């Protein structure tokens, strides 16, 4: 086509989606990670995660308002990944890298799994 | 913070949100523009438009499944802007620029209004 493109549009959209999440506006699901609960938008979770994409395209699970993750999932690792979904920024630290990588593998977030593998390899 | 950032994350999110729109997955509103209907996600519309942001934060309108736009709104101009919301690409042409700018003014999409004003000024 002969379209023009606004460079900052995708980033501006994601910033506003994070503002709606922070104010709990039109969030339609709560993700339960052991004792912890995280409110989010199903569409953003699907857009970022192979696991959530599979869950919310399922004809029965698409209608659930609560999703319980596997008890081995670390709430902090999930929190870091949820923040990444809504911001593009990943708070990867020596103290959380193992939990973040395991959570990213479970959530099927391949780019995160890739940077975790590389950061771990450099420390070996 | 000491976060790392994935450059293509926002664009990849928007691409997947457009794929969900194309397959009519988790769309939660229909925008009526005279004889034409457009299915979308309320969160994406709010993230792109000052008008939709105001509509869907209203305590009664937030729950509507159908929104009727002003009868002066051109369906093609709306279609072009909805495509822009989900892709960052604007199909701006001599034959549609007036309708696109008027629709962008109504929808409160300031960056679109700005490029339309500039493209019109160059042709004068």
């Amino acid at each position: 086509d002969s379209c023009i493109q606004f460079t900052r549009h995708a980033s501006d959209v994601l910033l506003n989606l994070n503002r709606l999440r922070s104010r709990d506006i039109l969030t339609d699901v709560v993700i339960v990670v052991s004792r912890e609960q995280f409110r989010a938008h199903k569409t953003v979770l699907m857009a970022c995660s192979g696991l959530f994409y599979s869950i919310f395209t399922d004809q029965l699970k698409c209608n659930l308002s609560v999703i319980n993750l596997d008890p081995e999932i670390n709430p902090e690792g999930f929190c870091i990944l949820l923040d990444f979904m809504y911001t593009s920024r990943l708070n990867l630290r020596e103290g959380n890298i193992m939990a973040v990588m395991a959570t990213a593998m479970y959530l099927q977030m391949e780019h995160v799994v890739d940077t975790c593998r590389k950061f771990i390899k450099a420390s070996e | 913070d000491s976060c790392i950032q994935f450059t293509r994350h926002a664009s990849d999110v928007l691409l997947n949100l457009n794929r969900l729109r194309s397959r009519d997955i988790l769309t939660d509103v229909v925008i009526v523009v005279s004889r034409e209907q457009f299915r979308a996600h309320k969160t994406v519309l709010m993230a792109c438009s000052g008008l939709f942001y105001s509509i869907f934060t209203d305590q009664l309108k937030c729950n509507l499944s159908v929104i009727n736009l002003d009868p002066e709104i051109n369906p093609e101009g709306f279609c072009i802007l909805l495509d822009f919301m989900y892709t960052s690409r604007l199909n701006l042409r001599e034959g549609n620029i007036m309708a696109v700018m008027a629709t962008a003014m109504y929808l409160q999409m300031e960056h679109v209004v700005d490029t339309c004003r500039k493209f019109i000024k160059a042709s004068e």
Binding site: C3, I4, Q5, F6, T7 | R89, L90, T115
Partner: peptide, 4 residues
Amino acid sequence: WVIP
């Protein structure tokens, strides 16, 4: 705005 750019030519993509």
